[PDB]
Ligand binder design. Structure first.
Ligand SMILES: O=C(O)/C=C/c1ccccc1B(O)O
Length: 264
């Protein structure tokens, strides 16, 4: 029997679906795992790793991040509020990356995906950092279908957390790029009701959300700096068996609380 897991099982039963959690305390090595190796749809959470992949490329391309991109209306996608706002001015690669991370801007994400060689190019970047689980197969908005049993556009909570650690705290990015990735995550605007709702107000948090909508499917991953302590990295993913089942931000926050409470 796994007593640590019982509150998570109760939570997912109340929710009406499945919850996957992995959390790592980088100071002690302590972890919390629940369905941590199961696949869940990435939804928009892929956009954080997209931004990291762009940052990695910028390490060999002088001024890539500062390069202006003058996209047209044909690049726009529903829920592209930053891209629409800057349509008449253009945006730099860095601004597109920040929009994808901090507003889940769909047009910005697809524009950057194209620069990287599409979903397979982002998947290849994740392979290059040692992530063998992540797979992106489609673009926005098709990647949100979240069909039960479909492995397209999925990863696992553990693989997400391990890759997030490598990119934000480890050596997968050069230091200036690691810091930029962290800065973008800390400026996210979409996650106030998810992992951020689980952490004490004085702790610093960088996160990236995902919401497929269908099949009760939504998620969040975060790096969390408790004041004066080594950071925690964690991922919380959800799904549900019926297409019209609704996702729950409260369930994501509640799972994150249990993860923080369960850490040594
Ligand atoms: O970050 C979120 O919670 C939502 C992102 C989003 C919004 C509209 C359409 C697609 C997505 B995404 O999850 O792919």
């Amino acid at each position: 029997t796994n007593l640590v897991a019982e509150p998570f099982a109760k939570l997912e039963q109340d929710f009406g679906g499945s919850i996957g959690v992995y959390a790592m305390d980088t100071g002690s090595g302590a972890t919390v795992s629940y369905r941590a190796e199961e696949r869940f749809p990435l939804c928009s959470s892929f956009k954080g790793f997209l931004a990291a992949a762009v940052l990695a490329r910028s390490q060999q391309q002088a001024g890539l991040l500062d390069t202006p991109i003058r996209y047209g209306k044909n690049a726009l996608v529903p829920w592209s509020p930053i891209s629409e706002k800057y349509l008449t001015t253009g945006m730099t690669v860095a601004e597109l990356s920040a929009a994808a991370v901090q507003y889940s801007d769909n047009a910005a994400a697809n524009l950057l995906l194209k620069e990287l060689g599409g979903p397979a190019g982002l998947t290849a970047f994740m392979r290059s950092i040692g992530d063998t689980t992540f797979r992106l197969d489609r673009w926005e908005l098709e990647l949100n279908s979240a069909i039960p049993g479909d492995a397209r556009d999925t990863s696992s909570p553990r693989a997400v957390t391990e890759s997030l650690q490598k990119l934000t705290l480890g050596s997968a990015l050069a230091a200036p790029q690691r810091q930029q990735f962290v800065d973008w995550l800390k400026g996210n605007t979409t996650g106030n009701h998810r992992i951020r709702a689980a952490v004490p107000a004085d702790w610093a948090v960088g996160d990236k959300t995902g919401t497929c909508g269908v099949y009760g499917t939504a998620n969040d991953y975060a790096v969390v700096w408790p004041t004066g302590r080594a950071p925690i990295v964690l991922a919380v993913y959800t799904r549900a068996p019926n297409k019209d089942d609704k996702h729950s931000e409260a369930v994501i926050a509640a799972a994150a609380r249990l993860a923080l409470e369960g850490l040594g």
